Design a protein around this nucleic acid. Structure first.
Lengths: 52, 180, 141, 262, 130, 59
RNA sequence: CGGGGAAUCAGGGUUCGAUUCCGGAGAGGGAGCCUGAGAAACGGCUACCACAUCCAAGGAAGGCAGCAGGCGCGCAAAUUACCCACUCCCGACCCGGGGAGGUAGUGACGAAAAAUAACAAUACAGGACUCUUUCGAGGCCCUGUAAUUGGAAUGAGUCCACUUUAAAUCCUUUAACGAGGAUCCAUUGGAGGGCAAGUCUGGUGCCAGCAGCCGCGGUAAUUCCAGCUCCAAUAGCGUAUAUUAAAGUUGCUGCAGUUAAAAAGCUCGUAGUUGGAUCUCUCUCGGCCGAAGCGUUUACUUUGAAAAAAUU
């Protein structure tokens, strides 16, 4: 986009939602839950800790 | 011994945290809104704003009736008014702290071409600025960082030597018109 | 606790310098034996001639053989083990050649897998190993 | 150093010459003469910077050696001659006489004077000795040694002398209520009436001087030059009357000047 | 080592030693006792004619030896106290360049101004580095 | 705009007297000596090495 | 070599300063002199020491820590160029001289600006809005991607002319040619966590290697090596070393000492450091004032004048 409504590559909302959607493809023993029905914005430090 | 001067300054400061998401977020947003080449332009404007705010912080701590505070602050407020950031109503040194980076990025000649209708895109504004098509009063400026003053804001023109201005169409029109 | 009077300056300053001699980094900078035992002699880089090739054994959980070289510096004559950085680059180093050697990056402390080897070869015969590994330049002799 | 230095670097040059930063490495070394290397104005700096008559050092050569410039009524051909305070410069070809007087801010102003005014000058007497069969001598600040003065002339006074005859004409005594000008320190160029002289045997006599606007200041004694008997000065003055305008009111004057002419 | 004179005198000793080594090295060539200094000239690019530079370089006392194809000569100067032996080679002819560049004391490469060097000269220089 | 400096002399003889000679040689009024500094200095030291009227012979 | 000062830095501070300005010192090492106002001078002399040049072997001559250049040392640093036109200096001097200095050359030390593409129509792909049960259909909706189409505008270059200049070069100004991306093509590091961006594909298989640290490799390698995609900075970007902030891990501001590193075995004791409460202007000489003592002496605070320019 342009102007003042520019949603960038590093947007916190989009990146958090992508982090939760990436969390959905973990191993089966990992317990995720229903973070899609409610809106999660999961940050990179939190997700990186979980992914590790 | 030489007849030269080695005085020179670095006009930007790199951020201390190299990859944090919110900083990259904000810088990329400003790059998008105001059409800039790299992050060093945003860092440059932020460093100039930090200079102005540091001066204001040194000036607030003095007593109100200090002659140095009075003279330096009134000169600084005059300077920021002439740029086109502050307002004649809020000419107080307290309000200088309430300044934002885009209030300086709105004053670039790129954005002043964009807003006033001389061009139609901000990348279009930059490409007109580089190619000697926009003048201020009577001087063709080629720099897209020219901070346009308030009295100088009023008349920005087509740079009469330009094909959009007075005449003399460029090489492409000249070549295509002599095809047959 | 501390001596905290108003005429207590020389006691405080003597205490500062005396205790500052117990600082490890300060003492390493200023005893001056850490710059006289230093093989590089306070230099960012040294230059040497290859004496022999060496295979240094890896440390316990890591199982490999790391390709090092015993070189001899020109400027004082000391013997130094240097680590050839990339895969398949030891063949570029030939016996008795000029090598430009650097530190490895921990300022005198042995780095990573290689034990007691704290230097790495940057250039061979005044051509960088990065160019030879990337196949950009050719090594003369 | 094994002998007297002969070059002067530009950045080591007296700041009041307002020399540039970028034209060269060197500055005109003022020759030895009647004035200190710091409290003076070489003829080249006055001729090619203040007046813009000459554009190079070589054009000052071409001017001074034609014999147009006169300092104190005598033709001086030296290009770096040390011209100093209260100094009369006469150019007969343009028919114009300037005086070197200190400016309000501490620099030398170019103060154009009447050719009637160019006949005399003022010299602060610096010492008085009696030598060689009881003959009294004055040494002034221009090193003008004068024999047989008025016996009332004492040290730190001023004598108005005639340039052509070289003799004294009349003297102003150092007394409270006399208009003086400051020739050194931070107070340089400020002109006011002497109110108090305080004594310190051993050290320097500090003097309190009230300005024309009531802003009192003080100096050491050696930095004082007496001009006016009472309140009326014995010479003409620059465009400013010697009162130091502070910064804010100077900006006020500047903005009023911009508002006046647009 | 202490005693600033002692450190300085040890450094001066080491300086003397390395200078004696260098001086002992450099008299082995181009002098009264030394053999002549052989300089081999290769014009890398095809545009260069080696006779032009070869006659600019030949002037000193000359002694023009001759062969079937190549032309090498002897130079002697008491001005520089130097004995030269210049021998010319052609790139591409790897026989002559290879078998007499392994005895030459210094190689002088000629380069055209416009380009770097010829592809044949590129082959020759690759072999000579190798 | 183009900004230059220009000066207007009264008569030609005064212009010959006062102008820098490089600004006269642009109008052909003056001709510069065509020796190089390095040549004029080697010659100076050469004739320094000689004493008497034989200083004139060397070149 | 000291200082002016440099980098960092909330406040305090820490580190540096060979280096263009000031002051000092020395011309290979020591020493002694001549002349002169000024020298223990070295682009002056005399000796010894250490090097070292030409010999006809009797003798003669040295001093680049001046400018260029070489060797050598090294991780580490430019032209044996041009000119006194500028800046100033020297002389007998409106004239002569100046490797002081200026000017070009080498120069990714570092610093400032700033190109490598802009717009429109189509062609798809998504996103919302409306109509449709949905599938689907539209918009004078949005957002992307297109070796798609259209035109215009330009500079890098090659080249004239002018200007610049001591003569040039450069920058600036004009004619001429000069641009469709499949090039007039942007790199350098990275994609396990710290730390932004892939559990993508193939190869090697605890090998080779990667990795500052934690660690990976033993077959689905998220880490090696390629490709593709992507990230970071961007005409710049990696590494090594020194030093600074982070380090309240040197602690004056402002650390700690039962158990984590640490209180002397104990007491006396000198220098040091520290130390209870207590106390509210005048007499003579001169024109109401100027001279003279002040008041036990200091610390403290405030004012004043002196404190190089450059740097800040």
């Amino acid at each position: 986009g342009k102007g003042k409504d520019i949603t960038t590559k590093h947007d916190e909302v989009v990146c958090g939602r992508k982090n939760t959607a990436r969390m959905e493809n973990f191993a089966p023993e990992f317990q995720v839950g229903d973070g899609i029905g409610m809106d999660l914005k999961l940050s990179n430090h939190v997700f990186n800790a979980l992914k590790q | 011994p030489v007849a030269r001067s080695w005085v020179c300054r670095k006009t930007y400061v790199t951020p201390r945290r190299p990859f944090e998401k919110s900083r990259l977020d904000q810088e990329l947003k400003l790059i998008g809104e105001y059409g800039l080449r790299n992050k060093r332009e945003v860092w440059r404007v932020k460093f100039t704003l930090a200079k102005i705010r540091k001066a204001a912080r040194e000036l607030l701590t003095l007593d109100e009736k200090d002659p140095r505070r009075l003279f330096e602050g009134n000169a600084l407020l005059r300077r920021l008014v002439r740029i086109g950031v502050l307002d004649e109503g809020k000419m107080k040194l307290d309000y200088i702290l309430g300044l934002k980076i885009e209030d300086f990025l709105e004053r670039r000649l790129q954005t002043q071409v964009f807003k006033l209708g001389l061009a139609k895109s901000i990348h279009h504004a930059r490409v007109l600025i580089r190619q000697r098509h926009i003048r201020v009063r009577k001087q063709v400026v080629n720099i897209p960082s020219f901070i346009v003053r308030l009295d100088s804001q009023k008349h920005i023109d087509f740079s009469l030597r330009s094909p959009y201005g007075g005449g003399r169409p460029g090489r492409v029109k000249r070549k295509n018109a002599k095809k047959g | 606790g501390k001596c905290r009077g108003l005429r207590t300056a020389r006691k405080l300053r003597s205490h500062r310098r005396d205790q500052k001699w117990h600082d490890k980094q300060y003492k390493k900078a200023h005893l001056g034996t850490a710059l006289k035992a230093n093989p590089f002699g306070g230099a960012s880089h040294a230059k040497g001639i290859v004496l022999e090739k060496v295979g240094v054994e890896a440390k316990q959980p890591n199982s490999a053989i790391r390709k090092c070289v015993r070189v001899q510096l020109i400027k004082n004559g000391k013997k130094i083990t240097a680590f050839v950085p990339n895969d398949g680059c030891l063949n570029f180093i030939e016996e008795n050649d000029e090598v430009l050697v650097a530190g490895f990056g921990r300022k005198g402390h042995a780095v990573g897998d290689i034990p007691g080897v704290r230097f790495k070869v940057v250039k061979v015969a005044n051509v960088s190993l990065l160019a030879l590994y990337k196949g950009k330049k050719e090594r003369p002799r | 150093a094994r002998g007297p230095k002969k070059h002067l670097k530009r950045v080591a040059a007296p700041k009041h010459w307002m020399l540039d930063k970028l034209t060269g490495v060197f500055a005109p070394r003022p020759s030895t003469g009647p004035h200190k290397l710091r409290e003076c104005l070489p003829l080249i700096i006055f001729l090619r910077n203040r007046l813009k008559y000459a554009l190079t050092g070589d054009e000052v050569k071409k001017i001074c050696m034609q014999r147009f410039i006169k300092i104190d009524g005598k033709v001086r051909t030296d290009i770096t001659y040390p011209a100093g305070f209260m100094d009369v410069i006469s150019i007969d070809k343009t028919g114009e006489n300037f005086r070197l007087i200190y400016d309000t801010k501490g620099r030398f102003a170019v103060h154009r004077i009447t050719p009637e005014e160019a006949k005399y000058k003022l010299c602060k007497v610096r010492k008085i000795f009696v030598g060689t069969k009881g003959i009294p001598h004055l040494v002034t600040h221009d090193a003008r040694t004068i024999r047989y003065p008025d016996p009332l002339i004492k040290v730190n006074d001023t004598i108005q002398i005639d340039l052509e005859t070289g003799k004294i004409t009349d003297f102003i005594k150092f007394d409270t209520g006399n208009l003086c000008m400051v020739t050194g320190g931070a107070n340089l160029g400020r002109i006011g009436v002497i109110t108090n002289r305080e004594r310190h045997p051993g050290s320097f006599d500090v003097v309190h001087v009230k300005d024309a606007n009531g802003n009192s200041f003080a100096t050491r004694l050696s930095n004082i030059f007496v001009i006016g008997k009472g309140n009326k000065p014995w010479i003409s003055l620059p465009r400013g009357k010697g009162i130091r305008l502070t910064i804010a009111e100077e900006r006020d004057k500047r903005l009023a000047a911009k508002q006046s002419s647009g | 080592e202490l005693s600033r004179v002692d450190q300085r005198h040890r450094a001066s000793q080491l300086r003397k030693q390395k200078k004696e080594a260098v001086l002992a090295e450099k008299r082995q060539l181009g002098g009264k006792d030394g053999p002549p200094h052989q300089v081999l000239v290769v014009p890398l690019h095809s545009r260069i004619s080696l006779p032009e530079a070869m006659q600019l370089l030949q002037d000193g006392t000359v002694h023009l030896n001759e062969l079937g194809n190549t032309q090498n000569f002897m130079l002697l100067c008491p001005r520089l106290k130097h004995r030269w032996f210049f021998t010319s080679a052609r790139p591409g002819d790897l026989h002559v360049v290879l078998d007499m560049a392994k005895v030459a004391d210094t190689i002088l490469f000629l380069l055209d101004p416009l380009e770097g060097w010829d592809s044949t000269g590129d082959y020759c220089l690759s072999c000579l580095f190798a | 705009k183009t900004t230059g400096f220009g000066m207007i002399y009264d008569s030609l003889d005064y212009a010959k007297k006062n102008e820098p000679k490089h600004r006269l040689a642009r109008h052909g009024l003056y001709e510069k000596k065509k020796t190089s500094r390095k040549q004029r200095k080697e010659r100076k030291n050469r004739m320094k090495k000689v004493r008497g009227t034989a200083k004139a012979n060397v070149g």
